[PDB]
Every structure is written in C-alpha cells, then in structure tokens.
C-alpha cells in the first residue's frame, strides 16, 4: 500500500485524544518513510518512522519519537528539551508464513493494553 | 503489580484466537520477568519477556515465537524458526504521566492501522 | 477541570451581545472550546470552537454573518458577540470544552437570552 | 453530516430492554483503525447534559454499567440494562469528527 493521512483514535491517558498524522516523505538512501504531526513548527512535531528491508532473513523497523516543548526564559522560540523515544523490530524469516506474521503483530498489539503494560509503563514499577 | 495470568482476546486474522499465559518466574541477574503459557514442551511455547530498568529509564519488551516441526525420523518435535518482537521505551528523568501513557497507546493503536498491517502481513514498504 | 459562563441578558433589537465564558482549570494549549448552542427544544445546533492547532476560527454555515470569536490568553476566558438578533435568540448558548477531535465533556452552566 | 435519530419519543414504562437506535447519512469510520466517532449524551430539563458513552462502545468514568451501545458502519444502538427511578429526559446521538452535528430528541 501506498502513504496516506492516518487518523489514529482511542489515543491518551484518559483515551479521547485523537491525533491526524500525515506523510512527509521517503528517504531514498534507506527507504525509511515518515509520518508527522502538522504542529506548525518542524521541530516540535511528532514522528513515526517505518522501514521493512530485504535479505537472510526480513526485518520491519518502527521508531516513534516525540518531543515536548519548553518555554526558555529570555527567548521566544520555545527549544526541545525532552525527547520521549519508542522502538519496535521484528524479525520474521523467509519461510514464514503470514497467519504467523499476524499472530504476532496482533499479540504485540494487545499485550500493549493489558493491565500488564500499563503499570509497565505508566507507573514504572517493575513487574516482580 | 505483581505477575498475573495474562489473558488476551481477538488475536490473530479472525480475531478469534484467544490466548492464556502465566508467569515463568523472574530472572536476579538481570531484573526481568517472563511469562509462557503451558504447551507440554520445555520449548515450542510462545514468550515474553518485560523489563524496566533504573538510572534514563529504559523498558524493553521481548517477545519470542517459535514453530515445531515433525522431524524426518525422529520421535521428538525440533524447532524450525522462531519470530521475534522487541519493544524499546526510552523516557527520560523528566517526563510526565500523560507524554508516556501517549507514548504507549500512539503504539499500540497505530499497530493496528491498515499502514502497519499491510506492512507486517505482505511485507512491503510504503 | 470546570468552566463558568456568566450572566443572561434580555436586551431587545439586534445590534449587539456580548457572551462571555469563564474558562478555567486548564490552558488552550490544546484543548478546544466549542459554543454549541441550544436553541429551543430539541436539535441543539453547534456554532464554532477556537483551536490554536486547527484555526481557531472555525465557523458551522449558515452562521457565519452573525458570529464573531476571539479568545485572550492572559486572563485564559473566551468571549463571543451576535451581530443581529431577531428570533434566533430563541434561549441558551452553551460553553463547552474537550480535546482536539474528541467529544465534548465538561459543559457550564447556561445562560440564555 | 446529517443524523438521523429514532422516532421522537418513546412509551418506556418501567425495567424493559429499552433501545434507542441512530442511523447515520453516512459511514463513521473516519479513523484508520476500526473507530467509530459517535457520542451520547444525557440532558435533563433542568441543567447541562452530561457525556455517556464515546467511541459508540466505551464508558466513561461515573456512569454505572447499565448502558451499553453496539456500534456500526452507520447504524447504532443505546441499549440500557432496563430503566431505573432517574434516567429519563432527552438523549442525545452526536458525531463529532472535523464538523460536529447533533439531532432527535427521546
């Protein structure tokens, strides 16, 4: 398929935000497309990075990454100063099937909501 | 909060294939912890393992999957190959409850768009 | 999060109004404010909303000549103006707030005309 | 976008399954994840309506689970787990993507 404006739903802490993130290009040198946020400003603006490569075996890469603006003092145009990362890869072989590609996306994906995750991530208090 | 019996529903194409995994207790070398689920096997069981870590956090979520195979001649299953998954988060000192609790579900949710789909299920680029 | 909308006029002829909504308990950073607006009855009608990352200057049809929106950070209250009034006036206008795409789910209380 | 609402009022006597059905002028899945866009909101004659259920499937915090909805491509329901003491007056069906628009009354 071909890059079109995604509009993802059911996305916050309390799930009524939404975001609409459009495409901004593909870089020939290693055929990573992008995603943004049209934030007005090209630096205080959310990123999706996604790439599948070729062979011996395949592999998908996908890197979010967002920042948060910070009023400096003495200065007007606000600078980045935290930067929130996320990474996700996979790494399937040639004589995989798909039924098993989707098995894992779709685990992966729900795995992210269970009770589990959330006091993974929100809390950081590790599992024990 | 501590390990609990993970039960996830609707996986896979028809969103039919329900899947049950219990804790396999925690590694003290390295603070992680891993969950399976019972296939009567020490190895053709699918897992995951979470982990957080103390400083620049950093949690990192692996996740392996193998396949079995009728071996030409042997009375034993053998592995063939397995899937992996590997989920990096990143935040800083700094950072709040709401950018990270973005952070999580802009993931999880943006798995499931047609984009990603398409990408992971046929394998092409954009 | 709670917003206030203050005071109902009675004035007569349509030369000009001026509604006022108290905001508080957050910042237009991103959020949206709506002006959804009640009539009578039912089929509760929406007007506009003032989004600095979409506009802010939104307006639903058929409204345009008779709505006019501006918002001022430093006191972080939104306030709006009705050009002509004959009997669209019917009764309230509400203020409510929410996020950029999402529903609307801390109304004031209304003040009608 | 136009909606459309179920007839104007019902004859809800008491603990019946009582649905409230919403049909759309067209398809709600704006989102690119299965999502629909839909609200319903809760007015009583008195003072300002208050928000039920959002994404047509999902509760929000302070509302008992007695209401439940089945979403759609664009036709959708408010089924309620029969009628208590206080739950009468209007109710609302809104979509509220890019343009919002109310409509219908009970």
């Known amino acids: 398929a071909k890059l079109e404006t995604v509009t993802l739903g059911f996305i916050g802490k309390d799930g009524k935000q939404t975001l609409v993130l459009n495409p901004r290009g593909v870089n020939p040198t290693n055929g990573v497309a992008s995603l943004s946020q049209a934030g007005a400003v090209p630096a205080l603006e959310k990123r999706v990075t996604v790439s599948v490569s070729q062979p011996k075996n395949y592999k998908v890469q996908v890197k979010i990454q967002n920042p948060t603006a910070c009023t400096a003092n003495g200065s007007c145009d606000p600078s980045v100063t935290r930067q929130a990362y996320a990474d996700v890869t996979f790494s399937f072989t040639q004589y995989s099937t798909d039924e098993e590609r989707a098995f894992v996306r779709t685990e992966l994906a729900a795995l992210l909501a269970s009770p589990l995750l959330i006091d993974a991530i929100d809390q950081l208090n590790p599992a024990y | 909060a501590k390990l609990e019996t993970v039960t996830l529903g609707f996986i896979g194409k028809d969103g039919k294939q329900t899947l049950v995994l219990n804790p396999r207790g925690v590694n003290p070398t390295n603070g992680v912890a891993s969950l399976s689920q019972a296939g009567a096997v020490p190895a053709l069981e699918k897992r995951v393992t979470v982990s957080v870590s103390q400083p620049n956090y950093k949690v990192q979520v692996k996740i392996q999957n193998p396949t079995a195979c009728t071996a030409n001649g042997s009375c034993d299953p053998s592995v063939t190959r397995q899937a992996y998954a590997d989920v990096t988060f990143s935040f800083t000192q700094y950072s709040t409850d709401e950018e990270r609790a973005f952070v999580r579900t802009e993931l999880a949710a943006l798995l499931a768009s047609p984009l990603l789909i398409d990408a992971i299920d046929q394998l092409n680029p954009a | 999060v709670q917003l206030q909308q203050s005071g109902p006029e009675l004035v007569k002829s349509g030369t000009s109004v001026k509604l006022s909504c108290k905001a508080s308990?957050?910042?237009?950073?991103?959020?949206?404010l709506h002006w959804v607006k009640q009539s009578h009855g039912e089929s509760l009608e929406w007007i506009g909303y003032?989004?600095?990352?979409?506009?802010?200057?939104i307006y639903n049809q058929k409204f345009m000549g008779k709505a006019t929106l501006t918002v001022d950070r430093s006191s972080s209250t939104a306030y709006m103006d009705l050009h002509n009034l004959t009997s669209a006036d019917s009764a309230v206008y509400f203020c409510?707030?929410?996020?950029?795409?999402?529903?609307?789910?801390?109304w004031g209380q209304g003040t009608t005309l | 976008i136009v909606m459309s609402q179920s007839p104007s009022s019902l004859a809800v006597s008491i603990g019946e399954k009582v649905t409230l059905t919403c049909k759309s002028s067209?398809?709600?899945?704006?989102?690119?994840?299965?999502?629909?866009?839909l609200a319903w909101y809760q007015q009583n004659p008195g003072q300002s309506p208050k928000l039920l259920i959002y994404?047509?499937?999902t509760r929000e915090s302070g509302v008992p689970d007695r209401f439940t909805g089945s979403g759609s491509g664009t036709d959708f329901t408010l089924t309620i787990s029969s009628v208590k003491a206080e739950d009468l007056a209007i109710y609302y069906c809104?979509?509220?993507?890019?343009?919002?628009?109310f409509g219908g009354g009970t």
């Open positions: 409510s707030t929410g996020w950029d795409y999402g529903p609307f789910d801390s």
């Open positions: 308990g957050y910042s237009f950073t991103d959020h949206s």
């Open positions: 003032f989004s600095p990352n979409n506009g802010g200057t």
């Open positions: 067209q398809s709600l899945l704006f989102s690119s994840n299965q999502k629909n866009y």
């Open positions: 994404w047509a499937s």
């Open positions: 809104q979509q509220y993507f890019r343009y919002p628009a």
